[PDB]
Write a protein that binds this ligand. Structure first.
Ligand SMILES: Nc1ncnc2c1ncn2[C@@H]1C[C@H](CNS(=O)(=O)NC(=O)CCCC[C@@H]2SC[C@@H]3NC(=O)N[C@@H]32)[C@H](O)[C@@H]1O
Length: 266
């Protein structure tokens, strides 16, 4: 709606830099751009041209050619989301563990916005592998992409974004009852949470996996998983292994899925 535009002031880049760059913080660079095709693509391109993107933050007020998983997209309107990418050096960490970086990001996003809701409705938490859900709706999507020696982590978080503007299965903080969400405050908390989770991931801290499990909507639920290639597998999600893969119980058999789309069943 056009009235939501009144609920969408621009980000304050200088304030964000003052809060997030300096002693005690690992973020080295932060930029807010008015518009770009894809923040993930932009940081990947910087790394491809030789830039050190570790601890580099890129935030876009609007994103016109957003990327989703598996060649899919991501829709946005100006100032309605927190749209950002960060660079993470990962070569120091065993490749088998890189999948958990993606899970850690979702946890960070959830923790950054969870206290803003008055009362958390049902189906609020993390859906494997990259979904922040609230009231069954997709509140945020996360995309991790590889560019040696880095991983670029992308976050699209619906702040005031109306589902009619982007996707029927979407939701936003505003549509969850948050009357006046402050993107500046939320972005600051998000990046603070993200730094901590990245540090935990790098040092293989057991609390990362523990905190993820505590917020998982998928573990323990009957699920239909749509695998790359189109095949569906129905079972009950039981756990996440040390590679960040989803472990399914299929009639007593174990099926471990590295990638796919999860649908929570009755
Ligand atoms: N705004 C939106 N909110 C909720 N759902 C949305 C949406 N826009 C589109 N959809 C759905 C959701 C569905 C795709 N889901 S997915 O395959 O699991 N992929 C993801 O969720 C990762 C998205 C990462 C986006 C960030 S934003 C910053 C960074 N720069 C990027 O270019 N990308 C990242 C399909 O695009 C529907 O149309």
């Amino acid at each position: 709606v056009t009235d939501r535009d009144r609920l969408r002031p621009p980000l304050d880049e200088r304030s964000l830099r003052d809060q997030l760059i300096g002693a005690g913080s690992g973020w080295r660079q932060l930029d807010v751009v008015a518009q770009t095709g894809s923040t993930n693509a932009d940081l990947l391109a910087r790394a491809a041209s030789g830039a050190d993107i570790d601890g580099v933050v890129l935030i876009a007020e609007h994103q016109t050619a957003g990327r989703g998983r598996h060649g899919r997209g991501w829709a946005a309107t100006a100032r309605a989301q927190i749209i950002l990418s960060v660079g993470v050096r990962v070569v120091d960490v065993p490749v088998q563990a890189w999948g958990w970086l993606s899970l850690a990001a979702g946890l960070a996003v959830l923790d950054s916005v969870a206290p803003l809701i008055a009362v958390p409705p049902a189906e609020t938490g993390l859906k494997w592998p990259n979904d922040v859900l609230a009231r069954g709706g997709k509140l945020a999507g996360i995309l991790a992409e590889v560019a040696q020696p880095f991983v670029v982590l992308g976050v699209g978080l619906n702040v005031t974004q109306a589902p009619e503007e982007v996707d029927p299965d979407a939701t936003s903080l505003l549509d969850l009852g948050v009357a006046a969400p402050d993107r500046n405050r939320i972005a600051s908390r998000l990046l603070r949470e993200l730094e901590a989770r990245i540090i935990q991931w790098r040092n293989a801290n057991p609390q990362l996996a523990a905190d993820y499990r505590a917020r998982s909507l998928t573990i323990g639920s009957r699920v239909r998983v749509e695998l790359p290639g189109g095949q569906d597998v129905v079972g009950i999600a039981r756990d996440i292994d040390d590679q960040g893969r989803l472990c399914l119980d299929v009639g007593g058999r174990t099926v471990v899925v590295s990638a796919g789309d999860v649908v929570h069943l009755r």
